[PDB]
C-alpha cells in the first residue's frame, strides 16, 4: 500500500513500506536526424543548474497517447512536424520513479510553426565528442538519442 | 533557493519557486559484455511493479568515486570484477531530479566471489527484441548498455 507525503504537479512522493517513490507523468523524446544533424534542445533545467543536451520531449498530457504527445512536443518545441514511428521505451530510474519515457524517430520534418527552449542541431558525433571533453553534460534521452543514431542510423 | 519538504534516505524533495524537484544521490552503471552476451540483471522495482532489464548499477557512497562504486556495484550485483573504463555519464530525468549516472564498460571479467538481483547474460540482440515485443522492459541503463553495444562493440 502507498500512503503520499506529496501530491504536486508533476510529481507524487509516497512511501511503499521502506521505500520512497516518486509517481510521474510518463514522457516522451523525439529522435529527428536532418543532413547529418540531430535534433537537440536545451533549456535550463533547476533540477540540475544547467542546460544538458537533449532530444524534444515532455510529458503525456490527459487525453493523450505517446504518439499524439511526441508530436505535440515536437511542434512546441521546434516548430517542426515528421512522420513518427515508435522506437522503444524505458524507465528513467526504476529504483524510485516509475517515470517511464516512450522514444520515437521523427522522419521527413517540415517546418509548421514559425515560433525558453533552444533548438540545436548538431552533428551527433559532435555532441559525443564535445560531451566527452567535457563541454556538455546529457539527459538521458541525449544520450539515447546519440546512442540510436550510432547504432542504426549512419 | 530550495526549501524542503522532506528528506529521506535516497532522496529529498524540495520546492524551488514553481518547481518541484528531487535531490538523488548520483549512481553508476556498468556495461560488460562476455561471449556475446550482455551482463543484465533484474530485482524486483516496488516503484514501477515489475523487474526491469538492467545492467548492474548502484548509488555512489560517502567516500567513493564513480569507479570506486562501479567496482562495489558489480561486485556486489554479480560476484565479478573486471577492468573498468569510464564511457560517458547522463541525467536521468534533468526536469525534477538532479540524479546523474555514470556508466563504466567493463572488460576481462573475473569471478571473485560465489555470491535478490538476478544475474542475466543476454545478447544485447535478445534483449532488444524481447522488449520490441513487450516481453520485457528496460531501465534508461539496459536501454544504454544495449544501444552502446549495437553502436560500438559489434
Ligand atoms: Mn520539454
Ligand atoms: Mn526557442
Ligand atoms: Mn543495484
Ligand atoms: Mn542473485
Tied chains: 1, 2.
Excluded: C
Excluded at 6 to 32: F, S, T
Excluded at 78 to 101: A, I, M, N, R, W
Amino acid at each position: 500500500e502507498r500512503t503520499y507525503l506529496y501530491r504536486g504537479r508533476i510529481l507524487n512522493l509516497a512511501l511503499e513500506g521502506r521505500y520512497e517513490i516518486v509517481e510521474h507523468k510518463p514522457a516522451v523524446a523525439v529522435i529527428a536526424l536532418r543532413e547529418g544533424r540531430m535534433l537537440f534542445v536545451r533549456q535550463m533545467r533547476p533540477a540540475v543548474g544547467l542546460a544538458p543536451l537533449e532530444i524534444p520531449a515532455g510529458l503525456i498530457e490527459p487525453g493523450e497517447d505517446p504518439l499524439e504527445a511526441a508530436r505535440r512536443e515536437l511542434a512546441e518545441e521546434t516548430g517542426l512536424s515528421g512522420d513518427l514511428t515508435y522506437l522503444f521505451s524505458y524507465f528513467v530510474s526504476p529504483g524510485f520513479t516509475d517515470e517511464k519515457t516512450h522514444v520515437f524517430l521523427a522522419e521527413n520534418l517540415k517546418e509548421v510553426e514559425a515560433h525558453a527552449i533552444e533548438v540545436v542541431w548538431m552533428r551527433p558525433e559532435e555532441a559525443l565528442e564535445r560531451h566527452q571533453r567535457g563541454e556538455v553534460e546529457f539527459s538521458a534521452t541525449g544520450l539515447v538519442g546519440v546512442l540510436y543514431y550510432h547504432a542504426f542510423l549512419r
